[PDB]
């Protein structure tokens, strides 16, 4: 019964592979040497004069079994198509998560399997990493007692970084004044592993966290009480693994859960979940709003699917094969999807990375959303 599922996965991938010419305008597959747990497009695009492609870049990491890990910047050529590693920097343990600082995108924070959060300026490390394997971060951020995944830079206050940990805490650092920086503030409101944390995109004092205690918490840094958030919501019937604030609608956010649902929230009335998106057959680990389309979000996880949702289709008639608000199911991955990123310069392009080393850069067909 174990290796029967292997046949199920192989046959579905055979059908998916056959159907890509009608479902996608772009599919690029690349096998990394090691899997990445993390993916984020860097903000820059280059469009060289008189070439048929543009050049984009991604922050990736490694997850090895007992070998030297690296923080990785890759380049991707997208048509108007190769994938190449531009730099590898020595990293202590697997890269749980890596995120660039909006106000200086050379600066990358990483979550390690130890309690340290690391900060690298990637332009200050050699082109080839040293074979010794020594990790020399530009800052070590102290405060946590365990590893974690949540990591968020404040887009409205340069150098302010949030991190969530398996120690039940959220740490805040102000990195602006290989030294050790202790946390400016530690928020202790959760009673279980804190899975994710994110700054509000507009209000510099405001952030959200989600945890294995099944709660969504909304925090305000101006509050003197670090053990109690401003709002505390029973969000889901299992662990909550991710959150994302809508970039166009300042009161709207989304949470993804081990209960297999994505929840839609309005900050002004957190007693009433706005909607529950249902179609995932297993735990959801990432949710991300489209940078380009206010009603579009995506979700991924353990069921090996990346679902794209359109909130404007909630309530439409049918005749079903799925709810009306499910726009697209990406079935290109044959293992758990660990992370994904919407490309900020090419609408509808997604990069998604899975546990079997696969990185896919893809775009659903135009007729599906238009």
């Amino acid at each position: 019964d174990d290796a029967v599922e292997e046949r199920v996965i192989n046959e579905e991938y055979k059908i998916w592979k056959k159907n890509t010419p009608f479902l996608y305008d772009l599919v690029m597959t690349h096998a990394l040497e090691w899997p990445s747990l993390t993916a984020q497009w860097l903000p820059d695009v280059t469009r060289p004069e008189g070439k048929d492609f543009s050049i984009h870049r991604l922050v990736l990491g490694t997850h090895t079994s007992d070998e030297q890990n690296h923080l990785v910047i890759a380049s991707v050529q997208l048509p108007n198509g190769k994938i190449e590693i531009e730099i590898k920097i020595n990293h202590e343990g697997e890269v749980n998560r890596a995120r660039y600082m909006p106000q200086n995108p050379c600066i990358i924070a990483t979550k390690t399997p130890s309690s340290d959060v690391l900060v690298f300026d990637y332009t200050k490390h050699p082109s080839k990493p040293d074979p010794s394997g020594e990790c020399n971060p530009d800052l070590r951020l102290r405060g946590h007692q365990k590893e974690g995944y949540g990591l968020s830079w404040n887009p409205n206050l340069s150098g302010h970084l949030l991190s969530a940990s398996d120690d039940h805490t959220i740490c805040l650092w102000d990195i602006s004044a290989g030294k050790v920086v202790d946390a400016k503030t530690i928020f202790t409101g959760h009673t279980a592993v804190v899975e994710d944390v994110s700054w509000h995109l507009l209000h510099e004092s405001l952030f959200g966290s989600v945890a294995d205690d099944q709660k969504l918490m909304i925090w305000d840094t101006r509050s003197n009480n670090t053990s109690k958030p401003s709002h505390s919501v029973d969000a889901h019937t299992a662990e909550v693994n991710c959150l994302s604030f809508n970039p166009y609608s300042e009161f709207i956010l989304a949470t993804g859960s081990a209960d297999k649902t994505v929840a839609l929230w309005d900050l002004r009335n957190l007693k009433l979940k706005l909607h529950s998106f249902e179609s995932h057959k297993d735990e959801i680990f990432q949710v991300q709003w489209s940078p380009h389309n206010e009603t579009i979000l995506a979700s991924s996880g353990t069921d090996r699917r990346l679902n794209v949702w359109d909130l404007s289709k909630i309530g439409e008639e049918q005749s079903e094969d799925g709810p009306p608000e499910l726009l697209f199911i990406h079935g290109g991955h044959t293992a758990k999807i660990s992370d994904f990123s919407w490309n900020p310069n090419e609408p509808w392009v997604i990069c998604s990375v899975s546990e079997d080393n696969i990185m896919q850069v893809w775009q659903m067909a135009e007729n599906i959303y238009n």
């Binding site: 096998a31 990394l32 040497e33 090691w34 899997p35 747990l37 997850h63 090895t64 079994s65 070998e67 697997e94 995944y149 398996d166 592993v193 899975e195 294995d212 662990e239 693994n241 680990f285 293992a335 758990k336 546990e355 079997d356 080393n357």
Partner: peptide, 10 residues
Amino acid sequence: MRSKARARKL
């Protein structure tokens, strides 16, 4: 609390 798989090399 997620459980990382054991990573295989290509």
